[PDB]
Design a protein around this ligand. Sequence first.
Ligand SMILES: CC(C)n1cc(C(=O)c2cncc(NC(=O)Cc3ccc(Cl)cc3)c2)c2c(N)ncnc21
Length: 277
Amino acid sequence: MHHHHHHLVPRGSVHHIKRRDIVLKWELGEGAFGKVFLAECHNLLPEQDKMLVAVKALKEASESARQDFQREAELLTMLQHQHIVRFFGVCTEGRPLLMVFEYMRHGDLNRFLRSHGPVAPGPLGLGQLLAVASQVAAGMVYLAGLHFVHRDLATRNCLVGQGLVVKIGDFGLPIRWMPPESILYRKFTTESDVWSFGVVLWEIFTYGKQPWYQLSNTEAIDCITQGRELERPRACPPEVYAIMRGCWQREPQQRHSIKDVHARLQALAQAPPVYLD
Ligand SMILES: CC(C)n1cc(C(=O)c2cncc(NC(=O)Cc3ccc(Cl)cc3)c2)c2c(N)ncnc21
């Protein structure tokens, strides 16, 4: 499960939160082992009595999943960046086991894009789409620097918070986002993450449409293995499509580096290009 992160050896122990300091409110979602709740957390930060957090409750007992829980918590404790979901610690007193994250009020980025298509409501402008893209790229520059391979970068795995701050997480194969070497050989690297970033850029510029939406799962696997490229979105300026194409080079060693992709997006976000579909 976390075997691919073995080279990452944690420095310190995970933060422990007392069960009575977590007050569950309501479910935010489920899927992967298992439910996610909005909660209030007491005594976490010294200046604030209580604050909102998202709490993931582990389903299994198990005791193989308990070892996977401790390993995951030690790895998440290492991830400290403005654009990576903030992990606050665990609650291991009794059952279920809990993981606690900073709450991101606007929820997942895929749903956010779909709801703000063609917080201030309405369609997101070019400047805003570039700001979202730049933030996800910043998080990916941080992960590459740590030699952390994400393996499932997609807008459904990003969160939106107050002031449109975007952070990367992993909420639980994502074939449509994968390059040919990941589909065929299960090779997951910094370079397959940059390819998925190019697909995330395509999702952002299509307001959250599924990649290869015109194709079945089988047809999409075949089209990616054959080397067909995703079409340029209508809302995408030429400068941004060039970034996507750089991420999608068939040869992994020819793909643009995430540092350069992020620097290009920063430049465009601080501009933006004069483009109208
Ligand atoms: C969309 C809804 C349901 N939602 C999920 C929230 C979570 O934060 C969350 C839920 N379950 C598991 C995790 N675990 C990770 O993200 C692990 C991880 C972190 C970083 C990297 Cl690089 C890789 C892997 C986190 C959340 C939230 N915080 N606020 C609002 N909605 C949330």
